[PDB]
Paper text:
Single particle analysis revealed the presence of two populations of ColE9 translocon complexes, one where the translocon was intact and a second class where BtuB was absent, which we refer to as the partial translocon. The final post‐processed map of the full translocon is at an overall resolution of 4.7 Å, according to the gold‐standard FSC method, with local resolutions ranging from 4.7 to 16 Å. Although the resolution of the full translocon map did not allow for local refinement of docked structures, rigid‐body refinement were carried out to generate a molecular model. In the fully assembled translocon model, the 22‐stranded β‐barrel of BtuB sits at a 35° angle relative to the trimeric β‐barrel structure of OmpF. Unmodelled density, most likely that of a single molecule of LPS, is wedged between the two proteins which likely contributes to displacement of BtuB relative to OmpF. The cryo‐EM structure of the intact ColE9 translocon reveals that the colicin also has to overcome a 35° tilt of BtuB relative to OmpF, which it does by having an R‐domain with long enough reach. The coiled‐coil nature of the R‐domain, with BtuB at its apex, means the cytotoxic DNase domain although absent from the current structure would sit ˜60 Å above OmpF. In the full translocon, the orientation of the ColE9 T‐domain is fixed by the R‐domain’s contact with BtuB. Finally, TolB is held on the periplasmic side of OmpF through its association with the ColE9 TBE but is not well‐resolved in the full translocon model. Density for ColE9 was better resolved in the full compared to the partial translocon where only the T‐domain was resolved.
Numbering used by the authors:
A (entry chain B), C (entry chain C), D (entry chain A): 1 to 340
B (entry chain D): 3 to 66, 85 to 125, 132 to 446
The structure:
């Protein structure tokens, strides 16, 4: 909500609370998502200010606090800041920002990430360009300088980050993304490339230096309907963990396919369906294997903009014999949301 | 940087508040017509407490270096600041007191064994050392307190020393001769009850007393806890990769003086080297007496006796385990035979209905059939297993006879030998 | 304070800061409460929205940040989220909520927990039904559908929580509470029952599976006066720790008695007195023992709703020879509060 | 920004986001400041309420969340609460507050701490009187009871804090500060003295119990100009770390000199210059050595009060052979800030 809108400056505090639970057979080790209480509250602030008629500056930040934790030593577990960046939007040439934000490839991957709780699994966090990461500088052009409506492009540089774990580390990178929206239809294509750090190479899985991700997305959204299909391929970019070996690393090659079809009703209802698949290739000692392979069937009732309820049933088609200890169990989630 | 901007000194305040009142600021009107809206309406409020209560009440429900046991060799990965060790005050467990008492009345007793194959899995650089600590009073005849500060080497009744035996390096408690170790004072450090001993030829041994947490014994895949605590002869080269010292604390610390040995983890090449030199030294020591037979035999027959003793011990172990396996399988059999008697009583029970196809009981009859045939197969399996266990047990029973005849022969040999 | 009240939706940001200190003989290990500076600030947001005349949805979240900690690795110590839930209030049938909230038994124990700083010791947190916990679904009726004024009832289901510590873990549970308020007088009764997890049973202390709590409360508040008396008994529900053994678990049996008498003045003053006692029975190896036995004598000056000061002196009657290493020392606390 | 100013109570939520980066030759181990992404967002609330015409109460709290951290185990690294206190302002006698706040000596050291990013290194946090600490009780007088305009004085008592580390621990302390502002000119003098705890003595470096700090500051700020010069001397108070020995402690003696000269332009520009030096003496085994010795050259463009950008290039004059493993490398930082 807008709390301060004065002196050519506007502040929008946006925050929400989600009472959530995950069910599944057993304790939930083999369940796709998990099991138990997943209640969480997120708080964030967005702010703008028109410095000049043609120049305005904006700053946005978001944090996530988990309620599932107890009041003991594990209170802070899972608590983090999702987005924290700033930037300026010129009139027509475009806009440039820097901070902790989604990677260009996420721009392409947004079409599939419309699910209530699950979805966008390929867009892992702290990964090169698919998810939200820290140390990105992005420039964006809207409508190609206002020349052609609906065709917009973005470019992003990624400063190297040397962290403790290869999972959270990266190196110098570059990327770009383009999105053309016409008459409701939408098309997108994104590509990102970066160098893996020594820690990443030292990992048992994964091979090569150029960590590469790219994705293509198509959609049609109108009349309370939303169709989307994103196909993305990556090299030495997707994270992978082996329970049998209890060893992690990256995938020499990966193809991911995502499909979404959601309908919306006037009476605050929105049924959704989603297919997903991810196959890794050239795995060290495991050949080709499927990381995730499932259907979605869910729904969402929108009481209003500020109140909603939803349910999602994930039909995990992955088999138990998968050579990476992946969860071969179905799952379900039920959530209720208040948001201001 | 940038903190100075604004940041008034002195008191802190910005501007005038909208209204005067601390708790009563609004617009106006009192005397109410009850209308809820008119000019004579007082509240001028609505949606009073539409939301539900949220935990009414104050809600302030309540209010806003594990030590290594003494005598148990353990791995310490070094730092730049040296090794880290944390001793306790609690006196050494029954184990070590036992061993040292036995040993009081060069031989020794093996505490632990080292396995480079495993030690490198966690410490690939092979930098890790093996620290061991005892309370000085149990080692030294003259308390370390009542000792001149000039003495650098205090005499000791036992030591913790690296040896090379049966193709492995192992940490063990030695004794039985005049021995004596460095004595060094423990400078303190920032941490409370934490000192720095520096033993010549070892790394900085930074100690830390802790009598709050109950003592622990650390368990590392390389370092084993050799159950066999028999007295064996010790290495001629014992200690060739060990540095120990009695460490004393400053007078205003109240910490008892502690003995600490720090042994290197040998690589397998260095272990073949130690074994070899040990064999050469055993060769040397062998003869030089009146003749080779007089002494060499002395040694071969005492070693052979000690081995036959180990054989007896392991045989007895096998026989106490085989007695329990036997009794267990026997009772499993008994149980399954009672279950069989039960099912066959249930079949005598419902035998009546065996040729009565339209009665309740004639269901329970075939059911008891199933039960009995199962319980019978079960009994057969328990019989097989019991037979097998009886075989193993008899074999063990003979193994003991043979092994203790062998001990008797080797002890007679070792007598004849010791006489010559 | 209400910051956003628009579009039939209202947001109340509520937060306060407390400069606090505890005094006691010695370092404060044996002190009832502790010793030193215990300043802390709490921030939270409440939100409502009337979807329909007869149906409204609400969400509330609260966090507590401690200032006593340093800026090093221990900055986050004692920082947590107390409440985070949502729910909807129908006109008359009642209301249903879910999230992280107080347990029904807290409703009964609220009468005694009116002290400025201390109080409600029996109402431990992350305990079955006495304190605020995560994973509860609660239904509440006010005045029995408007049939009988002042008589309201609530029911609560508790999803199982398998945490690392038995102190913070639980299992499936249920509970109910009834409260009749008439002409200022008040009566309440609450009962809760749940199953202990393997970790709880595995604890050295404590025995059995059925963890049971229940409580009865009486009060009269009027004429600037507040009298209250809550008696609660529990089995295998209260946590207990032995300093001599440095071992914890739960209490096979516990009786708790709380009594409060507070007067309030027109000139922002409220002196308070409180007696308290809790005796555990069938303790493993300690038989029956007293966990807490103390008097309260304190006061609170209310400069205004947003500013207040207070003091509380706790006469700990526990003896030093207590068979659980419990603090047998008195204590005192002095606090100043700002709140919006 | 002021979000709620009603009922004689006013709340000013103030928070900002900073997209920041540090550059330097090499990995950045020896760089003055460091290297990489240092983006962070701070949130805080200030509140006042005029209880009486002559008596008002105020409460202020601030927290800092770092965004440079990852979403793994290191999410909370660098996250802390800077300020959390309250207090009351009487009409003329002065004002008295308590909580977690800046130490009196910080008042003197504020003049130099005008740099965009670097600066105020001597004003370490959780240090006796130079930086912000918890457990202070302060009284302040403005214009000496309104007797002499521009001359104000403050006194502060420091409750002992027994923490795990000597770096973050302290004991009973006292201090005072006086500031006279006349016609743009400003003069200040502050002194603080306290006793070191036993844990502090245990440090290898440092000797004695009386940890003492004091400082004198001069400035002239007006006409878009700001000059400042703070000279401070301390005994057994400043922290020092030896990388070669990997051992820390305190400085038996320390002299610090800070000088700043910044100009501001009407068109949102502010070039800045800063000289700095700190020499420790009678160090145990290191004699006398210089902890910091560098020049600053930087600038800041102020788009408006709520939006700004800045840069700072630090010419580190420290030599590599310095006897404390101090970073003898230059550094630079570039930052962009949004703040409400």
């Amino acid at each position: 909500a807008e709390i301060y809108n004065k002196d050519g400056n506007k502040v929008d505090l946006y925050g929400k609370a989600v009472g959530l639970h995950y069910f599944s057979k057993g304790n939930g080790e083999n369940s796709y998502g998990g099991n138990g209480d997943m209640t969480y509250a997120r708080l964030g602030f967005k702010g703008e200010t028109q410095i000049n008629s043609d120049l305005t500056g904006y700053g946005q930040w978001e944090y996530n606090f988990q309620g599932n934790n107890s009041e003991g030593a594990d209170a802070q577990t899972g608590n983090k800041t999702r987005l924290a960046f700033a930037g300026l939007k010129y009139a027509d040439v475009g806009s440039f920002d820097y901070g902790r934000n989604y990677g260009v490839v996420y721009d392409a991957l947004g079409y599939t990430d419309m699910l209530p709780e699950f979805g966008g699994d390929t867009a892992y966090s702290d990964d090169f360009f698919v998810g939200r990461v820290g140390g990105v500088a992005t420039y964006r052009n809207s409508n190609f300088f206002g020349l052609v409506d609906g065709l917009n492009f973005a470019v992003q540089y990624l400063g190297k980050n040397e962290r403790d774990t290869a999972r959270r580390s990266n190196g110098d990178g570059v990327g770009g993304s383009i999105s053309y929206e016409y008459e409701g239809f939408g098309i997108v294509g994104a590509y990102g490339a970066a160098d893996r750090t020594n820690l990443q190479e030292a990992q048992p899985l994964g091979n090569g230096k150029k960590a590469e991700q790219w994705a293509t997305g198509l959609k049609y959204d109108a009349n309370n309907i939303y169709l989307a299909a994103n196909y993305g391929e990556t090299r030495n970019a997707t994270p992978i963990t082996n329970k049998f070996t209890n060893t992690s690393g990256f995938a020499n090659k990966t193809q991911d396919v995502l499909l979404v079809a959601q309908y919306q009703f006037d009476f605050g209802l929105r049924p959704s369906i989603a297919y997903t698949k991810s196959k890794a290739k050239d795995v060290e000692g495991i050949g080709d294997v499927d990381l995730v392979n499932y259907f979605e069937v869910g729904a969402t009732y929108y009481f209003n903009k500020n109140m909603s309820t939803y349910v999602d049933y994930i039909i995990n088609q992955i088999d138990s014999d998968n050579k990476l200890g992946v969860g071969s169990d179905d799952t379900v989630a039920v959530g209720i949301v208040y948001q201001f | 940087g940038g903190d100075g901007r604004g940041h008034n000194t002195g008191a802190h305040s910005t501007s005038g508040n909208i209204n005067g009142g601390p708790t009563g600021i609004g617009v106006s009107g009192g005397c109410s017509d009850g209308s809820g809206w008119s000019s004579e309406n007082n509240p001028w409020g609505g949606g009073s407490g539409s939301g539900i209560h949220w935990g009414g009440g104050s809600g302030r429900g309540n209010g806003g270096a594990a030590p290594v046991a003494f005598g148990f060799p353990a791995l310490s990965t070094p730092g730049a600041g040296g090794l880290a060790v944390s001793i306790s005050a609690s006196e050494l467990s029954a184990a070590i007191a036992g061993i040292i008492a036995k040993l009081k009345k060069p031989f020794g007793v093996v505490l632990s064994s080292l396995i480079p194959s495993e030690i490198a899995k966690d410490d690939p650089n092979m930098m890790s050392k093996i620290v061991t600590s005892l309370p000085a009073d149990d080692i030294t005849e003259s308390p370390v307190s009542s000792l001149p500060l000039d003495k650098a080497t205090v005499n000791v009744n036992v030591r913790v020393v690296d040896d090379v035996k049966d193709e492995r390096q192992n940490i063990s408690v030695v004794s039985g001769v005049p021995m004596s170790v460095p004595v060094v004072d423990a400078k303190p450090t920032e941490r409370p009850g934490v000192f720095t001993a520096s033993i010549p030829g070892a790394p900085v041994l930074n100690i830390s007393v802790n009598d709050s947490t109950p003592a622990v014994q650390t368990l590392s895949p390389g370092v084993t806890n050799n159950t066999d605590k028999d007295v064996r002869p010790a290495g001629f080269t014992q200690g060739g990769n060990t540095r120990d010292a009695v460490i004393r604390f400053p007078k205003d610390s109240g910490h008892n003086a502690v003995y600490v040995s720090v042994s290197d983890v040998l690589s397998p090449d260095q272990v073949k080297q130690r074994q070899d030199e040990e064999n050469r030294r055993q060769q040397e020591w062998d003869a030089t007496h009146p003749v080779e037979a007089a002494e060499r035999n002395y040694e071969r027959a005492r070693a052979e006796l000690n081995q036959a003793n180990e054989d007896v011990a392991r045989n007895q172990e096998r026989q106490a385990k085989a007695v329990q396996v036997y009794n267990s399988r026997k009772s499993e059999l008994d149980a399954a035979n009672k279950t069989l008697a039960d099912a066959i009583a249930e079949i005598k029970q419902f035998n009546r209905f065996a040729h009565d196809p339209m009665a309740g009981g004639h269901r329970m009859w075939q059911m008891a059939g199933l039960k009995a045939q199962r319980a019978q197969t079960d009994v057969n399996n328990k019989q097989a297993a019991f037979d097998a266990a009886a075989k193993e047990k008899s074999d063990a029973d003979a193994a003991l006879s043979a092994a203790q005849e062998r001990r008797k022969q080797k002890e007679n040999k070792e007598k004849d030998a010791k006489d010559k």
